């Protein structure tokens, strides 16, 4: 029965029913429906029988004109500024945070080589006010999962084995496979997850061999996280949130709160992100290769005379590809490399 | 059908509560909810049961109550007050 | 309804059988057995198929054709138990000796019934009622060989084999206790005073309740029948289960098993834990009554046991036939059996001679003792190996695991103290509690090998304390309060603390065992890995030769094979040599010196703890083992000095 019709303090009542031929396989669990059917009884106290119903009726990708708008946006000379401005507009300042979130949403390009090695595409960011941005990322993203550090069950973030025969269940890294996942307090991570997130992030897999269980789980996702150590090495970019205390801002927020108590929109931006993810996967030009290699050896020499490592060069490449992805340019260029290393200053 | 149990206040000290079962017919169904304290009027009735006779080994009949009735705003003066 | 032709006529095979029983010889062989049966001296007849093959070959060489009876009784084995029995009944000779015939109830009953028929006149009863014997087939020798000679694992027994005679290899899982089963039932009619019989084959039957005898009927005497045990025929029955070896299970599968039935004198041959070659007849088990009508065509199946071959002869099965006498005389005449037998243990491992000699003395063991007031003293010997990583400890241990007829191998990490000793499991669905013994019970009267002894948890090692000295287990848990027997000797291996032995500390620091447990080993051997350019070269040459040729390098020495070694050791474990006063004085004087030297040097770096009274009986046990190996009936002082040397050498590794 409908939830808004139940009397207070009672659990809802239900019925069982039958259908055949073309009425089969027409609905799925959780959908609200209207039904026409004969009400009758069947055998299964004294002189007493069970009721049921025999059903006789039930009631319950882009176009060209869409992608034209997305193409018009693609050739705007200030699109990067427009997308950064559209992200959490109420939050004051924090420019580079918004830029990093754009790069996280867009992502790099996946690649597979002749010898079978597989190259990652995802992006990972950490943030050290901060509560709002994760909710916004949840809303804008095509697929999103939100959780706090302790997790929804004993699976925690990654996974665990539980007990009577043993079984296994996955946390909020397996469930977010193929999409984005945001963690509200990364410091409240449990002990097992502290070690398991290494494999979850580097390999995009979780593997367990316990109590006769022997399986491997997929963890293909981009992680956003916030807190307030060596665990910072797993992330591509780390930043610290900043605040400003203009009274007009608080007064405006309060006035809006009283109003409810008494630039690109979200849906359009989400569809545009989906379109860009589906249509393009750019490649580095040779000039970018020379630029990046020279910068890499330059920084390592500067540190030597006074660390950078290959695992961070391969992150700078992904950021460069994600920046080139917005323009739908099939090749990345020095323009994107410059902004990539400029935005690389986490520190 | 409804199962009825002695109220805890009525039970003497050091004794377990007793139980009986009540049959509700056309107009009286869903008149009461579990956990309510209820007052019942009806006929006290009995019938043969094979399992009771088999287990106890004596010609022992089972008993049921058939309910006839079941029991458990403001004026303008209250509003003015 | 329909019918077919087949190539076999049973009349010819029956004629062949009755000729074979009266003609064959290696007088004729089987007529002696049937004479013993007639004299009531013998209860069972075992038919060899090797005799039938030899008979066929001899008849062929005489220039005559003959049916291949061997394959005929292998193909359809069930029918021929009846043919042989009928042939034996026909040809049975008369007794040679007086019997006291009146002891038999059936004789009196049948004689009186015959007299009743004789008076009345002025088949009677089923022939199974008077067969005083059992009959079994023994399969073909493989070295003469056919499928019955070639063992099958339990997976290879397909549905094609139903009805045939086969051989199976595996481990027994459980055994039932004996109970009787009816073959012929006897009744008595009250009014007319007449007896009738009924034969039972199926798992169930309906007893008779009306006297249908013609004389009883024609007198219109509707009498009542009553059952009688005193003239019924029973036969002993037992049921077991066999299961495939764990090392033959394919990957990812669960092991399978078969049900075995045993009747007659073959009963209580099998025991749990045995590795065995069973051979028998593989048959189905039909349903009965209303169950059959709605059970479908899927048939249950089992194996009728006929003959059993064990892989290793237990030491208790020994008897000195002249065949074994001739072989032990070889070793006795050759001489110096101690060194040869010690050298023969694991020839592929270089050096380590003293360790091998100690482990031989472990294999032999001391003499059990039981004082007149009821005290008893341990006979078994316990040994421990302590040494650096990579000096063939696990290898030598697992090598000794082969020689012993009863033995088990276990590692420290994979073992629970409960499962190592005995467990009280709530196993059945009926919530019943049942006791099932652990590894040390399965190794009863054998050796138990415990590798990685240092990794086992400190709490679980305490379970071994009772079994080591008292050779028994005591349990008092939910619904169970009993004592079990565990007459087992323990051999163990371990690394010192921190792995490789540390010379900075004393031996007791490196050993890291409590005093109560360190005392319970009769010998603890300390072996260290110290480089040397001379010795390493020799070891490397030996190992490289072994890898090249699969044979130990040899110029002078020939090891005795394991079978003859087992025969010599089994013969040596029967002697019980006694001590003498001259030896007693010597050992008594040695013990004082040992304890004084222990008291002097408890502070010293060369300490190994304090000598308890259990060190005296260790000397006596080792001396008696040495006396056993030379087949003496008297301990000699020569044995005592060797026992003392073998204890002294264990500590010399400390001095580089």
């Amino acid at each position: 029965e409908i939830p808004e019709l139940v009397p207070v303090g009672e659990m809802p009542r239900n019925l069982t029913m039958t259908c055949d031929r073309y009425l089969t396989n027409k609905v799925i669990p959780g959908t609200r429906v209207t039904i026409v059917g004969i009400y009758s009884i069947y055998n299964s106290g004294v002189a007493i029988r069970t009721p049921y119903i025999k059903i006789l009726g039930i009631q319950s990708m882009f176009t060209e004109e869409e992608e034209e708008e997305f193409l018009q946006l693609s050739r705007n000379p200030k699109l990067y500024e427009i997308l950064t401005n559209s992200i959490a507009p109420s939050i004051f300042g924090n420019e580079d945070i918004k830029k990093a979130i754009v790069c996280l949403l867009m992502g790099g390009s996946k690649k597979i080589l002749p010898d079978g090695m597989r190259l990652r595409g995802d992006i990972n960011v950490l943030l050290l006010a901060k509560s709002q941005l994760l909710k916004f990322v949840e809303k804008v993203s095509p697929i999103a999962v939100y959780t706090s550090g302790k997790g929804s069950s004993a699976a925690g973030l990654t996974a665990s084995v539980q007990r009577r025969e043993f079984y296994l269940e996955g946390g909020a890294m397996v469930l977010a496979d193929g999409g984005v996942v945001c963690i509200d307090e990364f410091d409240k991570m449990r002990d097992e997850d502290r070690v398991a997130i290494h494999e979850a992030m580097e390999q995009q897999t979780i593997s367990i061999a316990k109590a006769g269980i022997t399986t491997v789980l997929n963890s293909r996702t981009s992680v956003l996280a916030a807190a307030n150590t060596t665990i910072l090495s797993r992330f591509d970019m780390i930043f610290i949130v900043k605040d400003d205390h203009n009274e007009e801002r608080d007064i405006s927020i309060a006035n809006h709160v009283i109003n409810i108590h008494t630039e690109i929109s979200i849906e359009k931006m989400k569809r545009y992100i989906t379109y860009c993810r589906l249509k393009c996967a750019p490649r580095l030009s040779p000039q970018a290769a020379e630029k990046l290699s020279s910068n890499f050896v330059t920084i390592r020499k500067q540190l030597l005379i006074n660390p950078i490592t290959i695992r961070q060069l391969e992150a700078i490449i992904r950021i460069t590809e994600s920046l080139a992805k917005l323009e739908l340019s099939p090749i990345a260029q020095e323009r994107h490399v410059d902004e990539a290393i400029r935005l690389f200053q986490a520190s | 059908r409804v199962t009825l149990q002695e109220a805890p206040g009525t039970v003497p000290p050091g004794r377990l509560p007793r139980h009986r079962e009540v049959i509700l017919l056309a107009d009286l169904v869903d008149v009461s909810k579990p956990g309510e304290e209820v007052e019942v009027t009806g006929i006290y009735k009995n019938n043969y049961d094979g399992n009771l006779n088999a287990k106890n080994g004596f010609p022992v009949f089972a008993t049921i109550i058939e309910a006839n009735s079941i029991k458990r705003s403001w004026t303008e003066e209250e509003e003015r007050e | 309804l329909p019918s077919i032709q087949l190539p076999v006529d049973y009349n010819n095979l029956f004629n062949e059988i009755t000729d074979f029983l009266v003609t064959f010889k290696q007088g004729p062989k089987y007529m002696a057995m049937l004479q013993k049966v007639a004299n009531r001296e013998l209860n069972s007849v075992i038919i060899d198929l090797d005799d039938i093959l030899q008979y066929q070959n001899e008849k062929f060489l005489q220039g005559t054709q003959a049916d291949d009876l061997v394959s005929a009784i292998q193909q359809n084995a069930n029918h021929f138990t009846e043919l042989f029995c009928r042939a034996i009944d026909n040809n049975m000779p008369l007794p040679t000796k007086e019997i006291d015939y009146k002891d038999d109830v059936l004789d009196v009953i049948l004689n009186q019934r015959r007299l009743r028929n004789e008076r009345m006149l002025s088949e009677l009863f089923p022939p199974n009622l008077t067969r005083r014997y059992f009959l079994y087939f023994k399969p073909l020798s493989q070295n003469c060989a056919a499928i019955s000679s070639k063992p099958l694992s339990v997976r290879q027994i397909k549905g094609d084999f139903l009805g045939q005679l086969i051989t199976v290899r595996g481990i027994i899982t459980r055994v039932s206790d004996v109970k009787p089963a009816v073959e012929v039932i006897a009744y008595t009619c009250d009014q007319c005073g007449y007896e009738v019989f009924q034969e039972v084959n199926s798992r169930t039957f309906t007893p008779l309740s009306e006297c249908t005898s013609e004389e009883c009927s024609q007198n219109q005497t509707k009498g009542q029948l009553f059952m009688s045990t005193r003239a019924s025929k029973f036969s002993a029955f037992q049921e077991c289960k066999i299961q495939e070896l764990s090392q033959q299970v394919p990957v990812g599968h669960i092991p399978r098993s078969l049900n075995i039935h045993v009747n007659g004198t073959l009963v209580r041959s099998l025991s749990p834990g045995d590795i065995v070659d069973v051979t028998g007849i593989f048959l189905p088990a039909p349903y009965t009554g209303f169950k059959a009508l709605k059970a479908g065509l899927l048939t249950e199946t089992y194996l009728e046991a006929q003959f059993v071959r064990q892989h290793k002869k237990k030491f208790a099965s020994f008897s000195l036939t002249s065949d074994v006498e001739e072989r032990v005389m070889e070793l006795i005449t050759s001489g110096d059996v101690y060194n040869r037998l010690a050298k023969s243990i694991a020839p592929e491992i270089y050096g380590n001679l003293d360790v091998k000699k100690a482990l031989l003395l472990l294999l032999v063991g001391g003499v059990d003792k039981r004082v007149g007031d009821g005290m008893k003293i341990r006979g078994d010997i316990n040994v421990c190996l302590m040494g650096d990583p990579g000096v063939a400890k696990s290898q030598l241990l697992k090598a000794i695991c082969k020689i012993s007829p009863r033995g088990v191998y276990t590692t420290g990490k994979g073992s629970s103290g409960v499962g190592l000793t005995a467990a009280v499991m709530k196993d059945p669905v009926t919530d019943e509690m049942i006791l099932e013994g652990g590894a040390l019970v399965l190794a009863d009267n054998g050796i138990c090998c415990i590798d990685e002894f240092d990794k086992m948890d400190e709490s679980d090692r305490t379970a071994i304390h009772e079994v080591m000295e008292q050779q028994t287990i005591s349990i008092s848990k939910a619904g169970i309060n009993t004592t079990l027997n565990a007459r087992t000797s323990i051999l163990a291996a371990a690394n010192p603390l921190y792995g490789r032995y540390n010379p900075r500390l004393s031996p007791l620091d490196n050993i890291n065992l409590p005093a109560a447990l360190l005392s319970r080993f009769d010998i603890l051997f300390l072996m260290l890995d110290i480089p040397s350019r001379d010795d390493d070269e020799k070891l490397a040459e030996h190992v490289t030769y072994v890898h090249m040729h699969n044979k130990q390098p040899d110029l002078d020495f020939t090891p005795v094979e394991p079978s003859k070694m087992r025969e010599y050791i089994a013969y040596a474990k029967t002697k019980r040599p006694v001590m003498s006063e001259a030896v007693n004085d010597y050992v008594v004087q040695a013990y004082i010196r040992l304890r004084q030297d222990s008291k002097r040097e408890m502070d010293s770096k060369f300490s190994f703890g304090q000598a308890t009274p259990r060190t005296l009986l260790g000397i006596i046990r080792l001396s008696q083992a040495l006396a056993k190996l030379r087949l003496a009936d008297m301990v000699d002082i020569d044995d005592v000095e060797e026992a003392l040397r073998l204890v002294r050498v264990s500590k010399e590794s400390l001095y580089q």
């Binding site: - | 094979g50 399992n51 006779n53 088999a54 080994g57 | -």
Partner: protein, 51 residues
């Protein structure tokens, strides 16, 4: 149960041969058929109770 109880099917050895049993078997249990019970474990009512 082993007797002809209406509406119920049949369920150390017993006795047999009786008419109602047919081929069935009958056993028994021991119990006690009592006739009275006595336990051995307002101030005015209490005072009236006393001697």
């Amino acid at each position: 149960t082993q007797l002809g109880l209406p509406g119920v099917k049949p369920s150390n050895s017993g006795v047999t041969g009786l008419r109602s049993l047919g081929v069935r078997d009958l056993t028994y249990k021991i119990s006690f058929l009592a006739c009275h019970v006595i336990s051995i474990g307002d101030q005015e009512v209490f005072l009236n109770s006393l001697s």
